[PDB]
Design a protein around this ligand. Structure first.
Ligand SMILES: O[C@@H]1[C@@H](O)[C@H](O[C@@H]2CO[C@H](O)[C@H](O)[C@H]2O)OC[C@H]1O
Length: 324
């Protein structure tokens, strides 16, 4: 059962940015406490999995939007905005995209993969626009996800292998043409550490924007840990923000490295407070902060963990109180 009378989390940040959460379509019924926590605390929603490539086009031409639409319907019912995650990724993407259809032992050509990417992107954006029109809650999409490797080079996924480095620009071009009202984001992890990957993201977006690619923002996943350095996060936000693009914290959670002790929860509270003070200070750049999961019991991190503001019993943790 949830605490109904404590402050609605997002309301604390109404003069800063929307506070969202990634959800599962099976946790949206009125009588479900996870759904109750969702509607109470967040004014933005993201599909944890239902809008990924495999979730939307499992086999070629066979689009499965029911779960995604259920989440959209819920967002509309609760006056929430949404982020669309994600049009291209190297995980949770069906193998068929990359296969020659006449000979599945061989790879698709650059032209075929680009056409499939265009058809997927266009169908996905046209689906939400035609089904929901002006009520579509999605304000932007993670057009590409995790396209850098951890050394800052372009990740050598099948997209890069078959098409070449311009596949990124093409994804943005296709998305922009399908729905110019959508804000387009490039999303990634570890770019908050002010290391080689942060520099690589800055370099890549600088290059693509100067070439006219319609990139509107950079999504920083923010899968941080109990040991993360706030100074590095601040430096990363400043560097990326200098490009004149929006910054969104897209998948926030805190890896506790197996220590879920009460002492660790207090340390987590101090770190989350510093993190949100930083986000507030950077409100001129940050346009959304989204948690990757509603409560600890449904976090994607392996156990044991305690990554979020609500615990495995759906109760507000010390970090929640520290922030509000
Ligand atoms: O249910 C999990 C999802 O939570 C997970 O989502 C990933 C998390 O890492 C990044 O934020 C990425 O962009 C998200 O898509 O994906 C695996 C799935 O089993």
């Amino acid at each position: 059962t949830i605490q109904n009378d404590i402050p609605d989390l997002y309301s604390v940040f109404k003069d800063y940015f929307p506070i969202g959460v990634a959800v599962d379509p099976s946790r949206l019924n009125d009588a479900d406490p996870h759904a109750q926590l969702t509607a109470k605390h967040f004014n933005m929603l993201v599909a944890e999995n239902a809008m990924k490539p495999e979730s939307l086009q499992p086999t070629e031409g066979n689009f499965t939007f029911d779960n995604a639409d259920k989440i959209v319907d819920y967002a509309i019912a609760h006056n929430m905005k949404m982020r669309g995650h994600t049009l291209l990724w190297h995980n949770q993407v069906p193998d068929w995209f990359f296969q020659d259809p006449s000979d599945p032992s061989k790879p698709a050509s650059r032209d075929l993969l680009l056409q499939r990417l265009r058809t997927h992107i266009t169908t996905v954006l046209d689906h939400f626009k035609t089904k929901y029109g002006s009520q579509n809650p999605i304000i932007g999409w993670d057009v590409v996800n995790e396209v850098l490797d951890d050394n800052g080079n372009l990740r050598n996924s099948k997209w890069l292998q078959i098409i070449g480095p311009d596949y990124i620009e093409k994804a943005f071009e296709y998305a922009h043409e399908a729905d110019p009202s959508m804000k387009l984001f490039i999303n990634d992890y570890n770019i908050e550490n002010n290391g080689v990957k942060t520099q690589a993201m800055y370099d890549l977006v600088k290059k693509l924007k100067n070439e006219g690619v319609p990139i509107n923002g950079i999504g920083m996943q923010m899968h941080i840990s109990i040991n993360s350095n706030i100074d590095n996060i601040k430096a990363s936000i400043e560097k990326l923000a200098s490009l004149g693009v929006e910054i969104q914290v897209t998948a926030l959670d805190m890896n506790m490295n197996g220590d879920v002790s009460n002492d660790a929860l207090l340390k987590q509270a101090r770190l989350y407070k510093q993190l949100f003070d930083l986000f507030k200070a950077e409100k001129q750049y940050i346009t959304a902060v989204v948690f990757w999961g509603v409560s600890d019991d449904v976090s994607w991190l392996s156990k044991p963990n305690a990554p979020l503001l609500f615990d495995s019993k759906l109760q507000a943790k010390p970090a929640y109180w520290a922030i509000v």
